[PDB]
Amino acid sequence: VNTTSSIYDRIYNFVALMEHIERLLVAELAEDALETGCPHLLEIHFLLTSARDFQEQVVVMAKEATEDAQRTVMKLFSRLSGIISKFDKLLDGLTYDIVEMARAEQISLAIRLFKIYDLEEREDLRIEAIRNIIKKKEIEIEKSSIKKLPN
Amino acid sequence: NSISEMFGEMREKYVGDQKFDVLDNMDWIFNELIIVKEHIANCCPPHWNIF
Amino acid sequence: MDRFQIGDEQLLRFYQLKTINPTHSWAQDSSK
């Protein structure tokens, strides 16, 4: 379980190439065709592709000098087409999802899929950054019971 | 809610296009804000413009 | 990869209160 190397090589490399592909496929637009088409498939595919690249977005802030130097450097060029081509792909699909949900119907399947991505990754993002703010509040509960013991 | 409150605030056309027709298209975007609101809570319970 | 097992259905299934786009499997957003 401390041997996640090849998954990080084929999934950081496949996170590079396939989210370069998901910089258009999961960042689908033009125009709606049910909002991407299907932004619960598309924009939330860029959300989980950005949750697999939350290894390069949120667990880049967890892997802060863990064991090596190129885990977030040689994979950072694998996160240029990996993280901001998935997170902003979910934000082109999310700003174009809610903008697609700002389109007068909008629609019975376009805002269903699009808003379903924008509640799934929205509330999942809320409990996620609430788990990181509760990592500074569970660390403020925990490490500030250790560093700020006071002893 | 700021796409119906930026479409709504954008539908002011501050003249007011006769003298006070800002809330005509703006409140029309408020009717589209109720329809998009309840349609989106029919779509998404957790977030994305419930009400 | 960038699906990412499964951003098509199961990661849109973190809420998925939208029946039926369907575009997302099942089911809810909170169980507390």
- The DSSP line for A27-44 is T--SS-HHHHH-TTTTTT
Experimental technique behind these coordinates: cryo-EM
Cβ within 8 Å, pair C9-A123: no
CA C9 to each of CA A21, A112, A130, B19, C13: distance values in angstroms, whole numbers, following the listed order = 19, 13, 24, 50, 6
Whether the CB of A15 is below 8 Å from some CB of chain C: the reply is: yes
Whether the CB of C17 is below 8 Å from some CB of chain A: the reply is: yes
Under DSSP, the state recorded for A111 is H
Asked whether A49 and A119 are in contact (CB, 8 A), the reply is no
Asked whether A40 and C18 are in contact (CB, 8 A), the reply is yes
CA distance C10 to C22: 12
Indicate which of C3, C12, C24 best probes the interface with A, i.e. most A CBs within 10 Å of its own CB: C12
Asked whether A24 and A87 are in contact (CB, 8 A), the reply is no
* Closest chain A C-alpha to C2 CA, distance in angstroms: 5
Terminal Cα distance for chain B, rounded: 9
CA nearest neighbour of A46 among A92, A112, A95, A111? A92
Beta strands per DSSP E along B1-51:
none
CA distance A23 to C15: 24
Report the residue from C2, C12, C17 with minimal CB separation from A19: C2
* CA angle (A58 as vertex; A53, A63 as ends), nearest 5: 95
Whether the CB of B37 is below 8 Å from some CB of chain A: the reply is: no
* Closest chain C C-alpha to B43 CA, distance in angstroms: 5
C-alpha neighbours within 13 Å on the C-beta side of residue B40: 29
Report the residue from B4, B32, B43 with minimal CB separation from A111: B43
Asked whether A107 and A31 are in contact (CB, 8 A), the reply is no
What is the torsional sign of CA C16, C22, C23, C24? positive
CA distance A102 to A142: 44
Cβ within 8 Å, pair A115-B36: no
Report the residue from A21, A47, A123 with minimal CB separation from C7: A47
